[PDB]
């Protein structure tokens, strides 16, 4: 996260760190949507151009973390995965459309002050909140800037949603119905953004009606750090909710 700041403890208790068993390393962000299910980006699991082809026995999720590196005993929960489900219409060969995956925990994770699930959006929350100029919050442990640098604790940033035509016109890459963009404009005195290590983490909005946090997006292609892009691209979670509910119902 670029131009973010240190998370207050428990600020996003749904934040999950996708973590490699061997070597032990941060791979991506992720989010807790129930005591058994974790949401991430598909390209965090399967992306052969970056030599990523992970199976369930390659991976851990670390839940309840604040420090990027410390073993946070008695606060974090480190979990193996039972199964990974990648969206059937995700195709890394073409583009990052439907960049979404579900991770089923081996066991339900116990909730605490530091571990609690985020809400999934419904149609109303999209229509009322997913609007140009409205800000959502992105969290992660990705790099702080270009390498050509890592935070000690989870970073927080608030980002404005970009008008769909404006984002379509900012790039020659196709912005599908399953994506939205977020990020500041060139004349803004804020420059927040997500970087690759933030991929798979949540873009979350606090409802002005009920004080609940709703995960509207998944970081799919941030523009910060080494990408030096214009706007960050996010998986539109609601547009893929049919698949999400299908998997949970079938395999929960």
């Amino acid at each position: 996260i670029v131009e973010g700041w240190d998370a207050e403890k428990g600020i996003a208790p749904w934040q999950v760190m996708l973590f490699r068993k061997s070597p032990q390393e941060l791979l991506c962000g992720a989010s807790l949507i129930s005591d058994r299910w974790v949401l991430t980006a598909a390209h965090c699991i399967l992306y052969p151009p970056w030599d990523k082809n992970f199976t369930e026995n390659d991976l851990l999720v670390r839940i309840g973390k604040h420090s990027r590196t410390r073993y946070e005993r008695n606060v974090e929960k480190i979990s193996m995965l039972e199964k990974i489900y990648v969206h059937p219409r995700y195709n890394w060969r073409e583009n990052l459309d439907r960049d979404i995956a579900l991770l089923k925990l081996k066991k339900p994770v116990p909730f605490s002050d530091y571990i609690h699930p985020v809400c999934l959006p419904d149609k109303q929350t999209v229509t009322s909140l997913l609007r140009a100029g409205y800000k959502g919050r992105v969290t992660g442990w990705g790099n702080l800037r270009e390498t050509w640098i890592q935070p000690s604790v989870l970073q927080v940033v608030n980002l404005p949603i970009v008008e769909r035509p404006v984002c379509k016109a900012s790039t020659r890459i196709r912005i599908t119905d399953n994506m939205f963009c977020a990020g500041f404009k060139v004349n803004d005195t804020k420059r927040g953004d997500a970087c690759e290590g933030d991929s798979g983490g949540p873009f979350v909005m606090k409802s002005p009606f009920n004080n609940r946090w709703y995960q509207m997006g998944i970081v799919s292609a941030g523009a910060g750090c080494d990408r030096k892009g214009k706007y960050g691209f996010y998986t539109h979670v609601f547009r893929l909710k049919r698949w999400i509910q299908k998997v949970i119902d079938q395999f929960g």
Binding site: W5, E8, K9, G10, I11, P13, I33, S34, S112, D113, Y114, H116, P117, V118, C119, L120, L129, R131, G133, Y134, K135, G136, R137, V156, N158, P160, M205, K206, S207, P208, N211, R212, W213, Y214
Partner: peptide, 30 residues
Amino acid sequence: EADCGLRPLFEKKSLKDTTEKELLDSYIDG
């Protein structure tokens, strides 16, 4: 489920975090 999106250390304790006001203030349309 019914508990989703409410933070034990914030919403459940009637506390606010340092920047959630920025988010609220961004809701300006109508």
